[PDB]
Structure formats: structure tokens, C-alpha cells
Amino acid sequence: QVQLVESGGGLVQAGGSLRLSCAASGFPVAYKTMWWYRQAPGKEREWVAAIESYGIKWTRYADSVKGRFTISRDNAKNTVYLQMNSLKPEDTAVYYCIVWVGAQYHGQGTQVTVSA
């Protein structure tokens, strides 16, 4: 019943921007803390950003993306967004959103490729 679906990835050149979406279903997005993470091919998973559930606002970013990425939420559309500006090739990876409703639930991921 709980389902996350990432989208918005693609192929851009260094310096461009993307906007990832995490469409949630089977539960209300606004009442859960959600994270974005990413996994590059030859490496292991890296936390990217987090947004606190509704009540006291709190957003957090990995140091390597702070100032370039913005996480935000649309409670009506039940969606979490990651605005990514000033993209670098080091940002190339599959991006996932994750929430814990008892267990953890993540999506299939969305591919972000940044060419130099």
C-alpha cells in the first residue's frame, strides 16, 4: 500500500539543474520525515538531504550539496521535491527517496547523469 515513486532524473551538463519528485501513496507525506539518498555505480549509498515531518520545520543537507540542493514538500500533491542546482559530475548517481512506516520503503530510483 505504501509506495514511493521517484522521477525527474535525466542527462544534463555540468552547471545545469534538475528537479526530482518523490510521489508518495498509501500514506500522508506531510506526517513522515523523509530522506533523499543516492548511489553511484562503483560506490555505496550516500545521504543527500532530509525534511522533517509537519510540525516544526527542519531541513538538512549533506555538506557536499548544501547551498546547491533544496528539499521541499507539497502536502496536497503528497510529493517531496529535490531541486538540484549547479550540478557536478560527482553528483551522477541513482537518487532514491526513503521513508520509514514501520519498515523502510524506497522507490525504484531515478538516474541523474552530469556530463563534464
Author numbering: 1 to 116
What does the paper say about this structure?
The virus exploits its trimeric spike (S) glycoprotein to adsorb to the host cell-surface receptor, angiotensin-converting enzyme 2 (ACE2), resulting in proteolytic processing and conformational changes required for membrane fusion and cell entry. Here, we take advantage of available sequences of five SARS-CoV-2 RBD–directed sybodies: Sb14, Sb15, Sb16, Sb45, and Sb68 (previously designated Sb#14, Sb#15, Sb#16, Sb#45, and Sb#68, respectively). These sybodies effectively inhibit the ACE2–RBD interaction and neutralize viral infectivity, and a bispecific construct, consisting of Sb15 linked to Sb68, blocked ACE2 binding and neutralized both pseudotyped and infectious SARS-CoV-2 viruses. Each of the sybodies represents an immunoglobulin variable-type fold consisting of two β-sheets packed as a β-barrel linked by a disulfide bond.
We also obtained a 1.9 Å structure of free Sb16. Remarkably, CDR2 of Sb16 shows Y54 in starkly different positions in the unliganded structure as compared with the complex: the Cα carbon is displaced by 6.0 Å, while the Oη oxygen of Y54 is 15.2 Å distant, indicative of dynamic flexibility. Our new structures increase the understanding of the details of sybody interactions with the RBD, and in the case of Sb16, emphasize the dynamic role played by CDRs in adjusting to epitopic surfaces. Here, we report five X-ray crystal structures of sybodies (synthetic nanobodies) including those of binary and ternary complexes of Sb16–RBD, Sb45–RBD, Sb14–RBD–Sb68, and Sb45–RBD–Sb68, as well as unliganded Sb16. These structures reveal that Sb14, Sb16, and Sb45 bind the RBD at the angiotensin-converting enzyme 2 interface and that the Sb16 interaction is accompanied by a large conformational adjustment of complementarity-determining region.
